[PDB]
Amino acid sequence: RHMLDKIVIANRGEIALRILRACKELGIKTVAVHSSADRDLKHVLLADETVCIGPAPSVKSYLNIPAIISAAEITGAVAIHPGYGFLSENANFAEQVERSGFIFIGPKAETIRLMGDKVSAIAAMKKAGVPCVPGSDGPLGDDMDKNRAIAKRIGYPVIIKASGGGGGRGMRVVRGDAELAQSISMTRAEAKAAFSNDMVYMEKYLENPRHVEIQVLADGQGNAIYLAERDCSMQRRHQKVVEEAPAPGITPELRRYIGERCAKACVDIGYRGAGTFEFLFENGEFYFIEMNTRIQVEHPVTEMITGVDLIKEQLRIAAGQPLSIKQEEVHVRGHAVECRINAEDPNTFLPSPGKITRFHAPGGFGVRWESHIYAGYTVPPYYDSMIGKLICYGENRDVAIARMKNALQELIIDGIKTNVDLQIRIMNDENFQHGGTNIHYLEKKLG
Amino acid sequence: MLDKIVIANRGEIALRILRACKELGIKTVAVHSSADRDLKHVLLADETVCIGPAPSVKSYLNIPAIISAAEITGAVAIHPGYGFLSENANFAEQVERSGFIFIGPKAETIRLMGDKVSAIAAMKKAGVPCVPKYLENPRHVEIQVLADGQGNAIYLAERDCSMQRRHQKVVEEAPAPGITPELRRYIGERCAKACVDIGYRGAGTFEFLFENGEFYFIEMNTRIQVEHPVTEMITGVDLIKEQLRIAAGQPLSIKQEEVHVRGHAVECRINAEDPNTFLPSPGKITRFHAPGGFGVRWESHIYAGYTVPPYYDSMIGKLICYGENRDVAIARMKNALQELIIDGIKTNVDLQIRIMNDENFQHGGTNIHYLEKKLGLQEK
Numbered sequence A: 001r002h003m004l005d006k007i008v009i010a011n012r013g014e015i016a017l018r019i020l021r022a023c024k025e026l027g028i029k030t031v032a033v034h035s036s037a038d039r040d041l042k043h044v045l046l047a048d049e050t051v052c053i054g055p056a057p058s059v060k061s062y063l064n065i066p067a068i069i070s071a072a073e074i075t076g077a078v079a080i081h082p083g084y085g086f087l088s089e090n091a092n093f094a095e096q097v098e099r100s101g102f103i104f105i106g107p108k109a110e111t112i113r114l115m116g117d118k119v120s121a122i123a124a125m126k127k128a129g130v131p132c133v134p135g136s137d138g139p140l141g142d143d144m145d146k147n148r149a150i151a152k153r154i155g156y157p158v159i160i161k162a163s164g165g166g167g168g169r170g171m172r173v174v175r176g177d178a179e180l181a182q183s184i185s186m187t188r189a190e191a192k193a194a195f196s197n198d199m200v201y202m203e204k205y206l207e208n209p210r211h212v213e214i215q216v217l218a219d220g221q222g223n224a225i226y227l228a229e230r231d232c233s234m235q236r237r238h239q240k241v242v243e244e245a246p247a248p249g250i251t252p253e254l255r256r257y258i259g260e261r262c263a264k265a266c267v268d269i270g271y272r273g274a275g276t277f278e279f280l281f282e283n284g285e286f287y288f289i290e291m292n293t294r295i296q297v298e299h300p301v302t303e304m305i306t307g308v309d310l311i312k313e314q315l316r317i318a319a320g321q322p323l324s325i326k327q328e329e330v331h332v333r334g335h336a337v338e339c340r341i342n343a344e345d346p347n348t349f350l351p352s353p354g355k356i357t358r359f360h361a362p363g364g365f366g367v368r369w370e371s372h373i374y375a376g377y378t379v380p381p382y383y384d385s386m387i388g389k390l391i392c393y394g395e396n397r398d399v400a401i402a403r404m405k406n407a408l409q410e411l412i413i414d415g416i417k418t419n420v421d422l423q424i425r426i427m428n429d430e431n432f433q434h435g436g437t438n439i440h441y442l443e444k445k446l447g
Numbered sequence B: 001m002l003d004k005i006v007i008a009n010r011g012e013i014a015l016r017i018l019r020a021c022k023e024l025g026i027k028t029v030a031v032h033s034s035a036d037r038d039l040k041h042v043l044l045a046d047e048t049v050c051i052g053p054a055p056s057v058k059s060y061l062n063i064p065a066i067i068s069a070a071e072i073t074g075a076v077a078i079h080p081g082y083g084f085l086s087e088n089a090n091f092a093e094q095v096e097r098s099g100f101i102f103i104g105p106k107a108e109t110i111r112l113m114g115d116k117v118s119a120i121a122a123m124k125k126a127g128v129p130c131v132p133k134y135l136e137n138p139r140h141v142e143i144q145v146l147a148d149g150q151g152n153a154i155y156l157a158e159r160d161c162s163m164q165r166r167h168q169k170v171v172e173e174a175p176a177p178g179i180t181p182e183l184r185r186y187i188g189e190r191c192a193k194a195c196v197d198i199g200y201r202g203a204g205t206f207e208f209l210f211e212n213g214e215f216y217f218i219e220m221n222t223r224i225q226v227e228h229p230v231t232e233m234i235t236g237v238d239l240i241k242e243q244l245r246i247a248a249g250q251p252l253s254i255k256q257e258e259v260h261v262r263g264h265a266v267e268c269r270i271n272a273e274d275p276n277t278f279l280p281s282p283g284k285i286t287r288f289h290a291p292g293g294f295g296v297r298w299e300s301h302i303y304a305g306y307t308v309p310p311y312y313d314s315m316i317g318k319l320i321c322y323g324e325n326r327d328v329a330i331a332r333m334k335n336a337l338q339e340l341i342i343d344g345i346k347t348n349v350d351l352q353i354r355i356m357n358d359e360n361f362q363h364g365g366t367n368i369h370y371l372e373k374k375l376g377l378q379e380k
């Protein structure tokens, strides 16, 4: 079968190393594009070719569209993998890659635009039969009588959300008519300033939901499959801390119900590659909020429970190959837990950059370590706080948690502040040990 | 479960055992020589006891010192690992006479199987095929077993350990290439019946020579196998935790029909020795970096700044890669071997890279003489 000869890894850190490994397993030549502050990245040191695309600030490196495309052209690369974050959900970038004759390892640019606009995305999901949060089902105008009527029909509390927003950014809870006009007005102003798009919509506000998300894969040959779910509720201020697969309390019947709807939605929108349907789960019911049109950070928990290498599937799809597995070949087996490891201060939660003086990774049966860090490595201040991901699998949830506790005790990261101690606390939490804690749990636990 | 156990071993296996104990909530007692105070498992153990000076005869092979440490710490069981006293029937007999649980078979089974004459007679009786014959180009194929010593016994597929130097395994893999589900079931059932017939208790391995679609029994290792992780990857069974459950007097919960072979796993033994002359290379590891990724399993006590002592064997770690198929497991091993950094000492990492890149290994089914023919070494 035909495979991509050479690709540009348009990312950094752990995800860039994750992509480099998948490339090497498939015999794909790698081009590591990097900022001047990232010359010592583990994947840069393992890459077949390297191109320094600019200085440390992301604007002149990882978000630098001409420099990334120019690197693909000079090295003779055929495709670009955007990873997560940066330009991965940037439709202009995907269009420019397509326009320049290189393969964008993701969905069509118009699919990114469709799902990136939250109002259009909900309408497409509702039409496809995916359950959505009751809401305005269209943008809000300036007629406050019409806005009060939508709030009445939905039932308070409600949430005002930016169509150009996403991932908890660009939203405001409204509990009564008195706060409605000002809340809409503030959300609009914030959205205009942040996204240069003042469009807002209204949604029913769910008080105690769980964040449950469905993993999908769709090829260019008409196949679209669901790879169970992940529970990503263990979060703080919209930042995921712990993710797990499958989600506790989800039955095979409920898994089948939601998964089939997501797979059908892929067919209807002509989805291609890896994707994630994010839902709020409350009182046995799923409610769509948004679709992630790229690989997710927490993808490894899905890989452990299904045996499917999601990055290798992305590369295969992009090369024009069919999905390597059929739906009937996707089986949920055992349980996996992921602890994100951050170079962060436990009091401020702010990134804690610096030089790692001593480093030791955990090992053992069911223990997977996803990280670019090594002894002597300097965590730069220019980017996000995540330095690694510790993933533990077991035949059941109890075994996965037991292995995580042991793995966190072997993990040594000196010279910088980390959330390792917090991760140990979460694993020891009696409510986490029972499972099914909602999205507000971690914040309530911390204070 | 067993409240507290003495890990009567060292290095990677002692760390392997400690992790299984911690998962089950079993307290650990790390008995160590004065040269092994800095072993990773010793630093992670709940309690530690120095059992003597550096030579194994004075420490790891010192029965009164091990028993005394188990008595003073209030332990109830002893895991002997592999090597050392694991297959010493007098040690197993004394552990039990002292009132402790021996994490292994009965002393009589160790004796029965430890003597080739009585072992072969027990196998002929049990219906296990033996050497009737000249086996010029055989493959080393071995069957993993678990028996509770209560009448239940299961086989957990096979391993191919044909890549050898001076009769020491270098690469191991599971399942064995070319072994059909019919052949697996045939040999496996005879091994499970043999466990019942000899009253076997715990983990064990039946080693065979495999040539022209036929098995020929050589010997039984009456203990956990070094290469046990490749079987664990393909079955999902934690073999050390099963040893611990059996020793606690729990019957096997795993039924034969619950044992499924999925994917493929390869193990590369990592040795502190020269990759060409095989001169042992003890010494301080000045820089260390372990490989990572999907299907990558690293089994080692080594760390940056740790000194590999000159007193013991050269095996410092085991690199185990799994995949949905043999090709994926080999591709993952190549990637993992490139990430593995061990500086300050000589290792066989470069030899392992050559073995993974060998076209006959990539094809599979190379015989027991292959590695030495590739390297130009004379058998002895």
Ligand SMILES: NC(=O)c1ccc2c(c1)nc(NCc1ccccc1Cl)n2CC1CCCCC1
Residues within 6 Å of the ligand: A118, A133, A159, A161, A162, A163, A164, A165, A166, A167, A168, A169, A170, A171, A203, A204, A205, A206, A207, A211, A235, A238, A280, A289, A290, A439
């Ligand atoms: N309808 C609601 O109750 C509701 C509540 C929270 C919502 C939520 C809905 N939707 C989102 N995110 C998407 C979004 C934000 C802003 C504008 C548009 C979108 Cl789609 N969030 C944040 C996510 C992320 C953190 C934990 C799970 C909840």
